């Protein structure tokens, strides 16, 4: 059904900074960068965000989101589970792997907790079989199941995740709130180029290795003083 469920509002709801999946408790390695004084001001914060988005977030998060989306459109569950397996086996930094899986779990459990939302037959099937969903893969299936246009789904997902990272820099560096806004504004052109790029890439690029990012994510496990789960 879903005669009363409006995708225009649902897309805002699931990307809301207060959608209860616990994003705010994760830095995905950023905290390590900050504590080691690689991100110390507005400028370095901006370089990091560009460096991270164009690496880890592009070839793992956005690309995977697109893959499970496209597969969902062809009701190709096997391919979707294959993508999720690759990610799990490709993500060496434990806290990074755990964080993504936790967020994946909570994303789906939050959707299912809304009894009046009917995700359809394919999403239910996917929700039943999935072993290691990530926030990005499950979102991909979610979006496709509801007929949400890919670029739109990518835009909302991309902005939300980046907003969370910017707010972390603001809290942790720290930075002024206006600095956060300048940064988010500066990121708009890159945002669009990442979406453009995402649409071009095929699965051969899935989980393209990052280097220092992986290292700092691993190093986060050893931080004596840590405010984040990753």
């Amino acid at each position: 059904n879903n005669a009363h469920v409006d995708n225009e509002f649902l897309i805002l709801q699931v990307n809301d900074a207060v959608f209860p999946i616990g994003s705010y408790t994760h830095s995905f390695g950023l905290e390590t960068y900050i504590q080691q004084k690689k991100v110390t001001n507005k400028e370095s914060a901006l370089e990091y965000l560009k460096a991270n988005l164009s690496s880890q977030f592009l070839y793992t998060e956005m690309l995977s989101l697109k893959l499970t989306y496209e597969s969902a459109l062809q009701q190709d569950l096997k391919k979707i589970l294959g993508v999720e397996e690759v990610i799990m086996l490709s993500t060496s930094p434990m806290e990074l792997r755990l964080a993504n899986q936790k967020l994946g779990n909570r994303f789906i459990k939050t959707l299912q907790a809304m009894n009046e939302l009917d995700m359809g037959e394919f999403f239910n099937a996917y929700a039943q079989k999935t072993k290691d969903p990530t926030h990005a893969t499950s979102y991909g299936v979610f979006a496709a199941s509801l007929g949400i246009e890919l670029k739109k789904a990518l835009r909302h997902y991309l902005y939300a995740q980046t907003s969370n990272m910017v707010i972390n820099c603001v809290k942790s560096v720290p930075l002024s709130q206006n600095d956060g806004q300048k940064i988010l504004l500066s990121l708009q052109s890159p945002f669009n180029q990442l979406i453009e790029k995402t649409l071009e890439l095929d699965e051969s690029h899935l989980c393209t290795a990052s280097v220092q990012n992986d290292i700092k994510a691993m190093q986060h496990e050893s931080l004596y003083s840590r405010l984040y789960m990753s």
Binding site: K38, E85, M94, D132, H205, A209, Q212, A217
Partner: protein
Amino acid sequence: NTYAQESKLRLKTKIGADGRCVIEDNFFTPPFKLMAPFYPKDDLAEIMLLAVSPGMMRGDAQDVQLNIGPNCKLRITSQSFEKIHNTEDGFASRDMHIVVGENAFLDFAPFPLIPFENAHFKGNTTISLRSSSQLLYSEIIVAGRVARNELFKFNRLHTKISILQDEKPIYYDNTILDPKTTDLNNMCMFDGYTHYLNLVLVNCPIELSGVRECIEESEGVDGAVSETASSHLCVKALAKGSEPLLHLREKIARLVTQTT
């Protein structure tokens, strides 16, 4: 000399009548060459792989097949770096299929990669283990010829690793380095460094703490270790020279070897 060359390396080992790991069969084409194994510890063979070569050019390909028989405990060592030249509109490649048997142990790593300007390199490594098998595998990538300030000038580098345990995937690596799409010197990639080490320890007698110790006590290295999904260890490190990474590997190999 009339066209691109193909180097081959085949190596199969087995426990001999004396209870020592020996070469059952081997084969190699230039510039590859294996030396007879010697025995450091009573429970470890060591075969030195050597190679002197001008480097790979457009079309050159390497094919490597390793087969470490059951209960064999072997370390394959080398000193050579693999230089990849300008490959123009083509590429150079290196394919490796590695099979480690029951309760067998393999310590191995291909030659560290040195990609010259406009080099296009494709590497595919597939590693088949048994549940009892043990593995210490690693790869080293250099940003180019650092001595002539030749950093990230190559065309494209794409190497892959897939490790199967009892025919079931336990680890993947998908390294793609393309200077034309990214600033590889950014703080999420090489981050000012020029040498990169990716190392995996599968089913080895060593704890996460032990490895992390070696890393912490290694000068010139910014590295880390973490448990993979399949309960094994992955080590990643950056350095401004190959030596610190090599010294780090030795410390780790040493640790894994100091056991009953």
